[model samples]
Target: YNLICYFTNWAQYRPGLGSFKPDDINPCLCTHLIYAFAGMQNNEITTIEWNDVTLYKAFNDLKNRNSKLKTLLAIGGWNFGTAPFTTMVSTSQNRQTFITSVIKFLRQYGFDGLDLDWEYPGSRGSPPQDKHLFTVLVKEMREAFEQEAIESNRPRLMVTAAVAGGISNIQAGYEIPELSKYLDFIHVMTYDLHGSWEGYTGENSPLYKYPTETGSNAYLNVDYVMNYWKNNGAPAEKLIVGFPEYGHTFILRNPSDNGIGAPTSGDGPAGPYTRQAGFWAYYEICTFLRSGATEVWDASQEVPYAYKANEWLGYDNIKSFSVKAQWLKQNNFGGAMIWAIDLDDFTGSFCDQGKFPLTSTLNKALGISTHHHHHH
Candidate 1:
């Protein structure tokens, strides 16, 4: 029951096939649906977009179609930065002030839970103390949720968090044992391990390391990230593995040199729909494939990458999703969490694989039954 699917608030603003709203979500597709981002103001949780309030109403309404579905609101993101979080956790008073508002915010918005997306506590510009402070914040939030539940006579609000998969980020920011004690689920972001940031091309989320990888490079894959967290004290059942619905794009440095370690000149052009450089949504990749791009499977990594002209991308297809799911079951991890449902071939118009193809593939791979209510 832990198939946690997240949809972005900004996805509604994307053009054409990339545009996704709450209504586009198939309620029964995931066990727990998380709205991508909320914001922080005056140390209190708040909405980020103009229509976020309206979206919350519509997003929560999906539960009417699937009674078993649970909804969560995530706060703090990469762009949200560290200043707000640092200030909020600076003092116990500020922490309590923020915690009190969270209960009210979740209740008012009809959210069943809250997901912390505070990128990292001690990394970036955040102070090292923030690592312990984050755990303290979670403990306090959990205690407050329990008290509020009994007093208000409502269900205890679930508290989960999105954490970093990088070894340094984890060691620098997280008190895994303490965090595991309170967080309902630990969403480890296993994607973006490698990107155009490097001079070479790399898979966005490889299941395993390339044979030649060593040192830090070897730890960038999903398998290592999951095991790192597990070995470090995060329980397997609480670790929600991340599955990206998008891929990292690159422009080959030399057309003649094209392979896993091929040198890249820079990021590929943005997708017509996503309009984001260095990234291509699954749907956009579909068009690339149909337009004569050559696809290659990295047997060692258990994922796929595509190339055409000088444009290259390493992405997950149906085959990789199934392989990762099988690995998850073998390792007895908690569940799969899609970064953003909107990035997938949601409408089934392009991928020729039906609606929510990547997500539904994860569902089928996990052996979860689909009981669809209806779709547009």
Candidate 2:
């Protein structure tokens, strides 16, 4: 039962459809909950955007409800870019400074461990030199965590990283074996395979390839990419496959013709709560389902998409989740990881099935016995 859920702190910033609170989290459903994210600068980890002390306390307090819950602080999100990571990990001096600050900050904030999220190792503004530097960073960070645990008599801190899902990223950003050396596990961002960035309507989180697949993105499916990680020197048990809690919504260029490869004018309508155009939370998708949009399951891809008028959405549902769960069990991989708990149907009020039904199904299939309860 290695479910690791990420909690996006800024989700609280989105009015209407966005905004998440720490108290809304249910600790029993998964093994780990990660707070995303803390900022990085000048070889130091900073809490520039979030309420450090209060949120840390509120997140960790979940352990009071369920003793096995573990929370981690993730640093360097997409917006943070690779510059800070490249700078901080470039020298032994800078690495030490970063390491020292991280331990002190984590202990003070009551986090169980840290999740390094440096977008990609060799891409973004990072040079090829970063491929090896990234490995050095993980090694030193793991060593520091170990030393801190022994000296302070604190619980042993786990080390993990959120990695890119595609092989292009696997090669360009990672020295796979090298980075995995000191890591407890690697969380792969398996979604975003397709989005508004792609002018064509396609699956956001397809489990396999559709018959019409081609191009460099052909191998982007969950099956191929996860195996690519294992074959390329990452240990299976130490891999966490990410499943998104949302879907990509696109506006069909021709409302008369809508299919996977159909051209898209742009994003679809924004959710009232999330307020993100071209993106639909599972809750919003539920509304579409209830409204009787044409829903169809793609057997080859093992995901579902619905189209209503000019809007087209591709996302994973209960059926797709079962396949993912079974795949993880069959392959002996760690487990599933969700992006942010807030985007889910938190109130048990959005979808009629109640809150966190998606995560509930995921947890149960992974053998995690949980109330799967969310704040109502």
Candidate 3:
């Protein structure tokens, strides 16, 4: 089913810094996995000051040891600034330097390709100049990869990105029609539509359209976002919808309505009183669900929700995941793109003491071929 999995900034996190190697994470957790490794900055490349040895070691292990897996470097993330990006793509000299650096890194590490996760292109938070430069970056990167493929006599390496799901982000920098031709696929981050950042508490990620009673028509449900991209020139076969393993929680004053629309009379979106506040990675959610939180389903959204006392945390489980995966197949999408694999309950006992494993459930629902060996 061409599943695309991601590992964020493998150099800085606890797992990235821990004893665990990328090869040890268990590729069985994914089906047709695409491991996104490392984040690079414009300045970092010019300085040639990357922790290449550590990253290369991780890549080597995955490549030689795990033949089923494919790895790619993810450049840019939520907080990566635009100053370096703007300067890096403004001139041919800088573009050449960046392209050469990418090729060198790929050769040294034995990576399959690159995944650009630029937070945004035409956004206010980043310098406005980045809007134009972002497009140039993609075009140049594609051309560079093509030239390298011709020279090396190897198949063209994969080039993709984790793009924003909302329409505004789509309009801002993504010239989907043109961009699709250059990219292998686009990972549409459909989660995080509603979070603790909002004034009211809501689902971290909802799978279906909320009923009229919910009061907001602007919140793009799964269908809206997917169809929007398809109609906007993004090929359905080249789109991978993102599904978050974690959930967002909020505390409410009234308990009768199940905290829906209740005044958020709590601290952060997550805390001790409300319990699950901010989104927990899948691993954290596994622990929380095993402890006491009960899974609840939202009929209106056709997704799952969970609750503990007066606090409400919205998320997805195996059942909802099965449904979503089927939807992806039915829509003829490329397949799924999960944020990270480590978050899932590898032990298999987190839910019903082994009755549920999100990936397995998804694979079955989507009718993905299971000929390849899987880890968890």
Candidate 4:
């Protein structure tokens, strides 16, 4: 199992929750680690003041303790939005500059490769030509990677993308068969299947679409997304299923009403740690469960959620990870890709299962050794 993990650079900003440091990581738990959301300016890669110099070294140095581990720099995020990518890929000259910058930037920062997270290539008001342009972008990138390896005499850098789960999303931004050849793997964002945007309560990441959710044929379930991508030309081995350690939140329209499809007024309160409105991390979810938030399992959907006093949250835990990991293996996927490593109870203080219980559980389920090459 080639398990890939994500490490977010911003989690350290949470006030009372001291910043997440690189030494906090246990690289042995995953095969690859992606440092997310590195920004770009003028079609050139840029780094955050936080991750620019300090975090980069600390992250890569982790390999010293776990020689088998690899790290990638994730560029673009929900905030990077549409412009940077659309502009960079508009012309061949532009694409060339962007590609060259990416290589130089990765080498300078000690990253093994890049993870392009465009959020979308054709969606979100992009020009009509984005789908094909995206293919060109990846093709050029792959060719450049080959050249770099031949010159440096080092292994070829890994290239991957975090993609949308909806069928319309896949069709709009990606060219599966063509892009698959250039990419080492495609991280399918199987979470966020439902959220406050739909204005109705729904699971954050459902494994299967429940028959009752047929009110709309588009129930963004994981099973549907994976099967859709593979059927549409994506190679199963190149697809790395995604698992989010967070969930969506909603406030009750009627405080008395608390169910899966419950009506909602708007977003729920923000996290004391993450400080993001209408979102909660797994550690927070566990706190609720331990304090007695009512738990509900959607048998048909194969997901779990909880509710109390007008607050509703949909998320995953060890049980869900086990189930999803099995799904990945059964389908011959390239193992799992986590959205981040910091969001979990990293200190072993909250969940009471010791540090990184969720990731450790996932590694065990995938039959990968968790303590391999791990040394204090």
Candidate 5:
């Protein structure tokens, strides 16, 4: 089992309570730590941030604190777009160049593996052939990883990818069986299933579809997404379900109309820390609760939403995290992947439940032992 947590490089640039750095990480909190958002330049992997080189060392050094911990470097992000990937995967020489650089870059930086976060393959304006090219990319990388291990007499580097969870995206972008054969873990982005863009209030990541949902809307929940992936030929044991530490925010059109499907004017006010409209870091949501927002648990959908005045939000708490972790374990899935731990209440100030309250809930639920007491 794995507790894979992502660490976004930009979190360190945030102000005050929002600021996060590699050293702030509780290495023992997760089994694997993925440093997100390296970039691609000239078809080779490159760090997007100036300090990435120094931070890379700090990130990998966390393994010393937890002997069993693994670290990976992820390239590509939602805003990184598909042009780079499209151009790079177009030729055998390009793919080989990228694959060769992956091994060298990973080894030089001390990462145990590489994570492809292409956002999607065929979708996002990428060509249809990308679906097949993506499969070939991983296949070639896996083969190179095996051969490199033999030559160096070291453990073979692992290959994994963060894949889309939406039905259409999955259908358009993934060849489940082919890619599954080469990937060590398939991290399905089960969050963002619902958000402000829908022009209504909906749980960001409901465990199940609500009873009133119909037609294509019925396919938007986590259960449907998970089962779809399983039925499509991905192995259950290699699937990693996402657990979001943040939530979607909305400005309710009518205060009394606030509920799962209530009409919304637009994105809710930005969080004090995240400074992003229509979004709230888990810590910010904690403050909302403490400031008198009423919390309502959607029994049918297995999620919680809160509203006070016109400000409404849907997010996960320790309770929801515990339940989700239980569901993950019961299904015999491989593990949980936290979208980004920097958004969690790392300082233990906002949420009285303690630092990384949501993440710790998973650690406890999944029976991951933090025997070293790395907390300080």
Candidate 6:
């Protein structure tokens, strides 16, 4: 089971907001697949650009130096422009053009595959329409790639996508039955189940099912998510579960009492308030854990939570991550896909006070042998 990691283009645009350099992070630590956002909806292929040549070089260097590292280009993202996609995938001519461009781009840049991150197919938080167009998009792209491979006599490139977490989103965008046939894998954004956006502030991504006291039966847990996909025709072998390294925070009115689904005092949804007085990325979480954040576990859910004073941040730790890793292996899942890699502590500097290296812990849990060569 290989662990996949993502690096968002937003990070490159706003490097000062995160903890480490894009090229400084080692891909070999926990993941074999590295995904990066390449194109957006409004941006034409020509409009799309690479800000970090060094990062691409690092990926190529890692692939050459370490046999395990494979990288893919992710296109489209939340709030990404969709006008070009609607125009490009609506007809056969445009579809062919899009596919040719994608292949040429990958070839030009040396990417191993492509991951479509379209937020949805038929609807974007609007009334849903027939999503048959998505199937056509996938089929056309796959067919174009195969035809090109046969013509060029080269290895076929991979096709995959970052899918929404809920069933509604899945049904609205993909012909699930047809999707399983064409793509290499489907990445489920399993986090953000609960956030400050809700009426009550809660964990950003809860590892387990919220207790009955939480009052919302709609909560999606790991078991529910995996089973939902399996039952909905997605093959277990091609399903990669997503793990978020960062934590979500909730400001509590009653610090003296902590229980599942406790009513939060603050108003206006749960996502805006963050632990550490602001939203911290995975890399920042590692720093906090090293400084003074103490780890707590929810035995029932097999997950971890960190808290200090009136503030609470919910996330996964080594113990919880280990359980998730073992669960994926036991369930015959394709592997795990972490949201981002830079969120981890790169040097042993952050977790000095009995702090644990999140990456090392994940590698240990997944039983991956960290060995690589230097590609001169």
lDDT of 2: 0.85
- For candidate 5, give the lDDT: 0.91
lDDT of each: 0.93, 0.85, 0.66, 0.85, 0.91, 0.66
RMSD of 4: 2.4
Give candidate 4's TM-score.
Answer: 0.95
Residues forming the 10-long window of minimal summed lDDT in candidate 4: 210-219
User: Can you give the lDDT of residue 92 in candidate 5?
Assistant: 94
lDDT of 4 by residue, 167-197 (tens): 6777788888898889998999998888888
Residue-wise lDDT of candidate 5 within 1-376, one digit each (tens)?
7899999999998889899999999998899999998999888999899999999999999998899999999999899999999999999999999999999999999999999999789998999999999999999999999999999999999999999988888988989998999999999999998887798889988999989999999998878888888898999999999989999889999998998899999998988788999999999998999999999999988889999999999888888888888888788889999988999999999989898888888887888974466668
Write one digit per residue (lDDT tens) for candidate 6, span 1-376.
6677776544544334343444555656655555465663422343244555556565556676567677788887776645556766667777767787888877777777888877777666433433676678787778878887899898888888888786667667777878889988889888777655554545555556766534334446776777678788999999988887676666666765544454455432232112234355555566556667667677767776665655566676666777888888888988888876655544455445222266666666676755466789
Clashes of each: 0, 6, 6, 1, 0, 10
Clashing pairs in 2: 12-19, 16-273, 17-273, 17-274, 18-273, 348-355
For all the candidates, what are their Cα RMSDs to the real structure?
Answer: 2.4, 2.9, 4.3, 2.4, 2.2, 4.4
User: Which of candidates 5 and 6 reaches a greater TM-score?
Assistant: 5
Candidate 6 lowest-lDDT run of ten? 267-276
TM-score per model over all chains: 0.97, 0.95, 0.85, 0.95, 0.98, 0.85
Stretches of candidate 6 above 4 Å error?
A: 12-19, 41-54, 81-83, 125-130, 213-219, 265-278, 286-295, 353-356, 370-376
Per-residue lDDT over 301-351 for candidate 3, one digit per residue giving the tens place of the 0 to 100 score: 767766666666777777678778888898999889776654555445445
Better candidate by TM-score, 3 or 5: 5
